Amino acid sequence: NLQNIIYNPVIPFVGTIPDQLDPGTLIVIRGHVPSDADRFQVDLQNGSSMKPRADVAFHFNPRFKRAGCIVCNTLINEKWGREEITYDTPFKREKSFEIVIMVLKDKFQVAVNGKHTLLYGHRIGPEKIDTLGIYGKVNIHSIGFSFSS
Amino acid sequence: LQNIIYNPVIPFVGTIPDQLDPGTLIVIRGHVPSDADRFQVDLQNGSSMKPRADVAFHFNPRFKRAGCIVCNTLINEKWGREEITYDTPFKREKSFEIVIMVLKDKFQVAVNGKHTLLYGHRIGPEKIDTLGIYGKVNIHSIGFSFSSD
Ligand SMILES: C#CCO[C@@H]1[C@@H](OCc2nc3ccc(C(=O)O)cc3n2C)[C@@H](O)[C@@H](CO)O[C@@H]1Sc1ccc(Cl)c(Cl)c1
Ligand SMILES: C#CCO[C@@H]1[C@@H](OCc2nc3ccc(C(=O)O)cc3n2C)[C@@H](O)[C@@H](CO)O[C@@H]1Sc1ccc(Cl)c(Cl)c1
Ligand SMILES: [Cl-]
C-alpha cells in the first residue's frame, strides 16, 4: 500500500515529495551500505536549491568510521545547528537496511529494520518539507511513502 | 536541573538562561483556579515595566463566555493583530501542560498532548530573554529543553 514507490534511483537523488509530511506520514527507504562507504545522508529539505543551499529540516547522517554513529542536524540559512549524535547505530558496511521515518507532530521517529533507532525534535515545521535528498555512498533499492492525508 | 523551576509565585518573571534556538521546548504545567478571568505566558525582550518590555509572544487564555486564547505581540508598547483560537483546552479548575516548540518561523503550541495553535514570529526569537507568567493561574513547573544542550 505504499505510495509513489520507486526503485534504484541514481545517487545523488533529489526528488519532490508527492504530498505533505503530515503527522503520521511514513517515508520508507530500503537500501544497503557499500563496502567502501564513509557516510551517506537522507535530507528532508525545504526546496532543492544548491545556492543559497536549501534548508534541511532533518539531516539523517550515518557515518561508518571507527565504531560508527548517526549524526542528525538541521541546516537553517546555510548554518548547521547542534549535532545530535546517536552512537547506538544499526548500520554496517555490507548490510542491507530498511529505514522508516515517521513524522510526528513534534519530532521524527526513525526505525531501522523494525527497531526503534532515534528521535529528533522538529526545528523547522515539517509542512515546509517538499524535497527528499539522498547523498553519499549508498545504494537505495526503493523509496515509498505512506501519507496521512 | 538548572533549566526548571517548581511552584513559582505568580506574577513570575525570570531570565531565560540560553537562546530560544529552533528546536527549543518550553514546558509549563499548572492549573486554572475556579474564579480565573485570564492568565498569560509572555516571552519578552527584557523585564522592564516602565517602559513595558516588548512581548514577542503573548499567549493569553481567557475564560469568560465560552473561552478562547488570544495571541499577540507588543512592540514599543503597541499591540498588533490579535490571533484568536476558539478551540481552547483550558477551563476553570482544570490542570494543563503547555508545550511551546520554537521553530524557525513560528511557535507551535500543544496543550495536554493535543495541537492548540501556531504563532508566526513577529520579533526574532533571538531577542527573547525573559519569561513572564501573570494573572489567575497556579504554575506547578516551568522547564526548558534548549536545542543547544
Ligand atoms: C563531511 C563533512 C563536513 O560537513 C558535515 C555536514 O555535511 C555536509 C554535506 N552535505 C552534503 C551533501 C552531499 C554530499 C555528497 O557526497 O554528495 C556530501 C555532503 N556533505 C559532506 C553535516 O553532516 C554536518 C552535520 O552536523 O556535519 C558536518 S559540518 C559540521 C561540523 C561540525 C559541527 Cl559541530 C557541525 Cl554543527 C557541523
Ligand atoms: C484585559 C485587558 C486589556 O489588555 C489586553 C492585553 O493585556 C494586557 C495585560 N498585560 C498584563 C500583565 C499582567 C497582568 C496581571 O494581572 O498581573 C495583567 C495584564 N494585562 C491585562 C493583551 O491581552 C491584549 C492582546 O491583544 O489584549 C488587551 S489590549 C487590546 C485590546 C484590543 C485589541 Cl483589538 C488589541 Cl490588539 C489589544
Ligand atoms: Cl518553521
Author numbering:
A (entry chain B): 7 to 155
B (entry chain A): 8 to 156
What does the published report state?
Galectin-8 is a tandem-repeat galectin consisting of two distinct carbohydrate recognition domains and is a potential drug target. Like other galectin CRDs, Gal-8N is ~130 amino acid β-sandwich that contains a galectin-defining amino acid motif coordinating conserved binding of galactose via hydrogen bonds to OH 4 and 6, and ring oxygen, and hydrophobic interaction with H 3, 4 and 512. Furthermore, ligands generally bind to the N-terminal domain (Gal-8N) with substantially higher affinity than to the C-terminal domain (Gal-8C). Since the expression of the Gal-8 gene LGALS8 is much more amplified in a variety of tumours compared with Gal-1 and Gal-3, possibly its most important function remains its role in cancer, particularly in angiogenesis and lymphangiogenesis, and inhibiting these processes by a Gal-8 inhibitor seems a plausible therapeutic option.
